[PDB]
Amino acid sequence: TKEEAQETRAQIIEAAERAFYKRGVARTTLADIAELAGVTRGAIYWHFNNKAELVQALLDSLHETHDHLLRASESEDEVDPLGCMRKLWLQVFNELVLDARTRRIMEILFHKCEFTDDMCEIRQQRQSAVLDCHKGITLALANAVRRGQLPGELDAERAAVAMFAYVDGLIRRWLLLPDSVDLLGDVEKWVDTGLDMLRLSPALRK
Amino acid sequence: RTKEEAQETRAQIIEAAERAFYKRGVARTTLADIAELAGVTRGAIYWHFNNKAELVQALLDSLHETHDHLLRASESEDEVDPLGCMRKLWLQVFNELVLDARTRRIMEILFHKCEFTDDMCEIRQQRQSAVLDCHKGITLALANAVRRGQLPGELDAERAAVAMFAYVDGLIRRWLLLPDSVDLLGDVEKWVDTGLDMLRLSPALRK
Ligand SMILES: O=C1CC[C@@]2(O)[C@@H]3Cc4ccc(O)c5c4[C@]2(CCN3CC2CC2)[C@@H]1O5
Ligand SMILES: O=C1CC[C@@]2(O)[C@@H]3Cc4ccc(O)c5c4[C@]2(CCN3CC2CC2)[C@@H]1O5
Ligand SMILES: O=C1CC[C@@]2(O)[C@@H]3Cc4ccc(O)c5c4[C@]2(CCN3CC2CC2)[C@@H]1O5
Ligand SMILES: O=C1CC[C@@]2(O)[C@@H]3Cc4ccc(O)c5c4[C@]2(CCN3CC2CC2)[C@@H]1O5
Ligand SMILES: [Mg+2]
Ligand SMILES: [Mg+2]
């Protein structure tokens, strides 16, 4: 049955989040996740080959809320690629602080997920996700340069690395020390600080 | 002598813990495993460390020594060029990461092979303490540079410290995950200056 299968996969993913958040990925097994989800008869193995597929599902689930702002910032036909990128990072930070699911998937991926040789797909799939995002940020920065919103001589690739590094570090800083960063109250200041680096730093120019 | 032999054995244990944590991760590695790798008895390893968290803290603490003279130079009110010492500090941070196998392996362990779990809550708390401490230091050096006129007078030192640390921390982990994406050694001056340019030119980082 169609709906029941998606029914069950969502139960498993939701239970996987609870299990990974409590006990970490390394020591959690699929059998333990099936126990939390209330699924039996090997159902979990029909939806996932291994834990890495479950981790990838959680990582893929983050790309959904922002799909439209990603598309807009990457499109050559977009009139305001820089403004759309600003709206994107504003949404990324807002969802992190406001959404329990997002914050806790990211906490799982960043602080409860080990890169090991017996589970090499986790690091490899993290490399691919970061690389994919870098391509998107680089392309959106190149659209802003062409629109006259960023320096004509900007090194879009290095500026994409710089922006990602800043956003990445800020998120992890808020996850580790929520009290230290009023990410929600000053979200615009935090987004503009990184954008300002791309706009003004002479080091980021070719 | 007792002291010399114990310090010798402690170093063997720490070195073997790096090899064990790096290969199998912190969560599934036991002190018994580390003892076998280090070639010491289980009683020996348990004399030096009560649990796995204490060993992780040992690695986490060793990172502070190499930079200890440059962070205190930028932190000193009497430093004539605090902004300059900060630049040399971050240059040295990135230089050691790329050149030093040990520092790279430890940071890879701490950032990518060590889970925050209720089963070992000391890990997260020690990371919280280390970041909070570094934040204070960075805030000191930024206020000195502002007072010395090297940074904007109306700069929010607290937020600027956060932003600089976020950039450096994010860059480190990007190079750890994708080394060929960041020539962190040949362009090290560019990568440091990019973040310093952020604190010095961003109108958002001002009150
Ligand atoms: O972080 C890292 C960095 C180093 C490694 O990347 C590489 C291969 C690999 C593959 C998958 C992993 O999860 C993982 C590794 C690591 C295990 C050891 N290797 C080194 C050998 C390819 C040369 C580890 O953890
Ligand atoms: O791999 C990835 C894929 C997607 C992301 O790259 C970006 C921003 C970001 C910044 C730092 C991370 O460690 C991290 C992310 C990710 C979290 C959220 N995303 C924003 C864009 C997907 C909308 C994640 O994990
Ligand atoms: O990131 C975090 C933030 C939240 C927690 O900090 C605290 C206690 C704790 C202790 C050690 C951890 O490794 C760890 C946690 C967390 C697990 C449970 N929480 C208790 C409070 C959320 C109710 C987690 O991961
Ligand atoms: O990546 C890094 C590189 C530099 C540090 O490693 C060391 C000590 C430390 C300990 C735990 C961290 O999470 C952390 C750090 C860092 C914070 C402070 N440092 C001292 C070195 C700046 C002189 C940071 O972030
Ligand atoms: Mg979402
Ligand atoms: Mg050192």
CATH no. for residue A146? Answer: 1.10.357.10
At residue A7, what is the residue type? E
| CA B141/CA B130 separation, integer angstroms | 17
Domain coverage including residue A159: 58-204
In a domain? residue A156: yes
Other beta carbons less than 10 A from residue A110's beta carbon: 18
**Cβ A161–B181 below 8 Å, yes or no?**
yes
CA distance A56 to chain B (A): 16
| CA A137/CA A117 separation, integer angstroms | 30
| CA A49/CA A46 separation, integer angstroms | 7
In a domain? residue A53: no
Q: What's the alpha-carbon Rg for chain B, to the nearest Å?
A: 19
Residues with CB under 6 A from ligand 4: B 60, 63-64, 67, 71, 89, 93, 127, 130-131, 134, 169, 172
- Helices B157-177 and B101-112 cross at an angle (nearest 10°) of 100
| Residue A40 Cα distances to A18, A30, A51, angstroms | 18, 11, 17
DSSP letter assigned to residue B113: S
Output the six-digit token pair for A143: 């659209």
SS (H, E, C) chain A: CHHHHHHHHHHHHHHHHHHHHHHCCCCCCHHHHHHHHCCCCCHHHHHCCCHHHHHHHHHHHHHCCCHHHHHHHHCCCCCCHHHHHHHHHHHHHHHHHHCHHHHHHHHHHHHCCCCCHHHCHHHHHHHHHHHHHHHHHHHHHHHHHHCCCCCCCECHHHHHHHHHHHHHHHHHHHHHCHHHCCCCCCHHHHHHHHHHHHHHCHHHEC
Count CA atoms within 13 Å of residue B96 on its CB side: 16
Interface test with B, best of A113, A197, A199, A200 (most B CBs within 10 A): A197
Same domain, A80 and A19: no
CATH number of the structural domain spanning residue B44: 1.10.10.60
- With beta carbons under 8 A apart, name residues in chain A contacting B24: 116-118
What experimental approach yielded this model? X-ray
Same domain, B110 and B164: yes
Q: Which of B56, B57, B60, B63 to mutate to test the pocket of ligand 4 (most atoms within 8 A of CB)?
A: B63
β-partners of residue B3 are none
CA distance A104 to chain B (A): 12
| CA A53/CA A169 separation, integer angstroms | 26
| CA A116/CA B112 separation, integer angstroms | 9
Same domain, A104 and A165: yes
Same domain, A124 and A177: yes
**Cβ B168–A169 below 8 Å, yes or no?**
yes
β-partners of residue B155 are B206
- Helices B157-177 and B122-147 cross at an angle (nearest 10°) of 130
Residue B161 contacts residue B142 (beta carbons within 8 Å): yes
| CA B181/CA B175 separation, integer angstroms | 7
* Cα B57 to ligand 6 centroid, rounded to whole Å: 14
Same domain, A87 and A108: yes
Name the resolution in angstroms. Answer: 2.1
Same domain, B129 and B34: no
| CA B59/CA B102 separation, integer angstroms | 10
In degrees rounded to 5, what are phi and psi of residue A184? -80, -45
In a domain? residue B57: no
Same domain, B41 and B77: no
Count CA atoms within 13 Å of residue B25 on its CB side: 24
In a domain? residue A99: yes
Match 């000193």 to its residue by tokens.
B76
Q: CB distance from B204 to chain A under 8 Å?
A: yes
* Ligand 2: residue whose CA is nearest its atom 2: A129
| CA A87/CA A115 separation, integer angstroms | 32
Same domain, B21 and B75: no
Q: Which residue of A has its CA nearest to B195?
A: A197
Same domain, B75 and B119: yes
**Angle of CA points B106, B111, B112, to nearest 5°:** 95
Output the six-digit token pair for B25: 């991760």
C-beta of A115 in contact with ligand 1 (< 6 A): yes
Same domain, A103 and A164: yes
Q: CB distance from A186 to chain B under 8 Å?
A: yes
| CA A198/CA A159 separation, integer angstroms | 6
Q: What is the DSSP string of B140-160?
A: HHHHHHHHTTSS-TTB-HHHH
Question: How many domains, in total, are found in chain A?
Answer: 2
- Helices A121-146 and A81-98 cross at an angle (nearest 10°) of 140
Among all bound ligands, the one having the nearest atom to the CA of B117 is 3
| CA A85/CA A73 separation, integer angstroms | 6
Residue A43 contacts residue A4 (beta carbons within 8 Å): no
DSSP letter assigned to residue B18: H
Output the six-digit token pair for B109: 């362990």
